[PDB]
Amino acid sequence: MNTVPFTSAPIEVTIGIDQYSFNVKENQPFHGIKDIPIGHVHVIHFQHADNSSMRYGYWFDCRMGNFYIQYDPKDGLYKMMEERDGAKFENIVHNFKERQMMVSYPKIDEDDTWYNLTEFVQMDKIRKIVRKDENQFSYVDSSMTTVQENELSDPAHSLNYTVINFKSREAIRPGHEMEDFLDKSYYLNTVMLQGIFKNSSNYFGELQFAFLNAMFFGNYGSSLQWHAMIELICSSATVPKHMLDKLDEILYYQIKTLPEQYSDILLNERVWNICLYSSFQKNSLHNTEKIMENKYPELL
């Protein structure tokens, strides 16, 4: 179990750690988060009390280094930093753990929610989507645009998700225009899976990461990416059977976790109705269809 200490908490802020969150008051004696499960990526995220604008946060994996959060009063945000001097960092963490100034990652033992939302998400792939190679952790915020949104403006600050475009030469083989547009199996299986992602694990990892950025930061381009990757599978007549079964589990846990009050902005009516009721895979997502119908029947 690992620890992300805080230098201090000089401004009142709501702090998220994965699907959990808590309020810290201005200058409260808060010194970080302990008992963080090893083996998973994690996200620590922030919304200031004075400006709920810009949610922002950091993806990290404690196996890759010792990370701490220090508030920067010039740039006005909580920043994640890396200490490579291990002896010095552990001396402080212990010193803090003794004074009980840390919140415990409050995982219920029965609970596989976080694993189920991050099963295929890997730090190495996150760092290719979010390019800032000098750090081992990745910053994301509500405003960052995707490479595809930039084609339709700062490239260093962009989310480099894999571009999916159903009306593109990449998606449509000459002479198979109707076939490839109405059945996207070529584009899914040859172009994207075999050609770009290499395997379905990497495809699901990017899909899961896009959903989590949409949910935790309200990042609109990430929501677009999540829905595009769902629709590409559902609009393919030929999909490996193990992929369909895994997608049903992935989406089930995503829909389960979504805040009920955010469904209006985070769920695209057209994509979900098309996917669940019209697409080739309309009968292949039993768990997802059942939770959607019982939790968000309005959208459908």
Next chain:
Amino acid sequence: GAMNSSNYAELFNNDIKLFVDDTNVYRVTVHKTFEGNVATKAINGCIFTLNPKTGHLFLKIIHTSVWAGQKRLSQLAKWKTAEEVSALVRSLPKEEQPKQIIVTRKAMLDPLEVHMLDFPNIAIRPTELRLPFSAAMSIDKLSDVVMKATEPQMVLFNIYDDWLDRISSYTAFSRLTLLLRALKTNEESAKMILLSDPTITIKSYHLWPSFTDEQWITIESQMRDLILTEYGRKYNV
């Protein structure tokens, strides 16, 4: 974006553009089978592709053999239309290719966009105008070449005959749409108006009769009467 009453005169500027109408591509007769079920029999159809500025009509005849062994023919017909329009564009010299293609039905947008991905600078547009191009098969010479075809064939016509020697393209299109709307609302009456007088003939190289300027005014008035009538006979007014 979409073409409507506000941006009417754009049709007659000097940017090459084509209307594409697909309403006569897939044509059937519905009939009873010996068992008393219903079946369709396809008949030849056509894509109506028209330059509104010059009157050039590229009539691609769709022979019934193209449907043999195919499913979901109404969907296929939209993609076949887009395939043939794309082939037409590729066949034209670069300086004759259109800058815009306006489809008369919104269901043609995605098929045509996909077939034209190679031409990113050609704009594919819908329209809010209710154009009467479905009535093209009420023009006897056009119906005749479609029904006689034994194989796929493209035939070129000028749908304005020689009108542009005497009138503008705006006025020529206005007349064409008026004639076609009349033929669509009451074909028998419209054709009677057009041919009642045997001294006015259709030249061999023309589609419509050789009316004088004065006679076109009378004709046009007779068509505007027919349309207002049927609009009463229909709605009882």
